[PDB]
């Protein structure tokens, strides 16, 4: 869980794990001299790691200055829930693939829809003034939902629906291919800033079912995810995937159910993001607060 | 505020609030014959209450010499609105918690940035030459604001944004843990004279739905608010908490809206401070008068 340390070499990371320092919490409670003599690492390097080890575990107060730097440095998309935006240090981020996995109805879909709409807002409103691309794997798209979310944001339905490139991926090959053709699609239309793949694992599970296949599944399935990650990294766009459930980087968020209207959000895998969970709701207007 | 009026039959206190004479300041400046014929209440009694309505907000005439003493004797943070400053008899005090509450847009938030910028100025300019710590609860912070405010006050934008410690509280457990560390922070940096928690109860209301674990939402909130109050009292620091709404808090100022720009402030409670209300405005420069 330490592979994500600010300004750190890969060589040392190894030496760190070798020495026996697996988690960031072991490094945290460590003494510079100790970690230094137990893995080569110059004394200056030993303490830099320890410092950064804490910053992730402990609470530190940045300054409104650094904040301005970051805010205008990278850019994110708002989910519609202030609570969730927080869990996501602002929201869905470009140049990175964020995944929402959770049981059926956990929020996954509505959130994909919400983002295909919110991405069109302006930076002032948690948007990036751009278009989305929804890749309907199991046939989950619902315009009745886009309309309601557009309505809530008092936007031109028609127009909002025209800013969402849509497409059905019926089997893995088509899923693999459509994605292959995203490079071209974005080149032709640079206003695209969001790629959405609902149920990415879906066909891969259907076609290569069982453990008798589990191997080459995650395999072909990881090559797919990389194709997506590379695209988000090269075109500076956000990629969102959903995986339905009861090692490919990017944020992984778990959605869960609470009493009827409410849902729980929790950070699983993610470097720059603070662990902990927050609640939000699924209303008629869409992904919003409780 | 009139319920607690000198020797008065509750039956009449009704006829008053029933005529609309809620606030004491309005009674104080009313006509015994215009009031008598408003709540039927006799002239004898009418007069007897208008006179008692004045002694209430009891006005004291000091010499310009007295006031120049007291103004220095006690350093308060101005708000940009001399009317609001008046309502607060100078400004926000240190070693005390002040609460602004009202509907989204009441000003409570901008008034927070305003303060995070004015605390930096020196006493003569309305500040305390201190630093501010902004605790973002629902993502209300905005740097473009701390900018326009630094601009209007002709400050060094960069240096103003460097004197504000910032941090977002994704949930209650976190909010709570940040305030615990708040103690250690002011020891670390004594230059801090202002703390601001925007929407203290946001997460509490949302994570403790309906009225259930209220056992602790309340137990927890108290220890959380008292905690902040010690902070202020022990470290000669001014503490500010906002609260959005459609027993501890030193001062409680309610804010309300008027025509899209003007906002009303009213002393809902606070020992010293003279009950009554005033009107200010939200400008591109910041919090000013109208």
Residue numbers in the entry:
A (entry chain B), B (entry chain A): 13 to 258, 279 to 322
Which sentences did the original study use to describe this structure?
Here we report additional three new crystal structures of left-handed helical filaments. First, the basic structural element of these three new helical filaments is a RadA dimer. The other protomers were then assigned as 2ZUB_B, 2ZUC_B and 2ZUD_B, respectively. A unique property of these left-handed helical filaments, as compared to other known structures of RecA family proteins, is that their DNA binding motifs (i.e., L1, L2 and NTD) are all located at the outermost surface of helical filaments. Moreover, the NTDs are separated a long way from L1 and L2 motifs. We found that the locations of the L1 and L2 motifs in the four left-handed helical filaments are relatively conserved, but in contrast, the NTD locations are quite different. The first hinge region, located between the NTD and the PM, is referred to here as “subunit rotational motif 1 (SRM1)”. Subsequent structural and biochemical analysis revealed that SRM1, a hinge region between the NTD and the PM, is not only responsible for structural flexibility of the NTD but also is important for RadA's function in promoting D-loop formation.
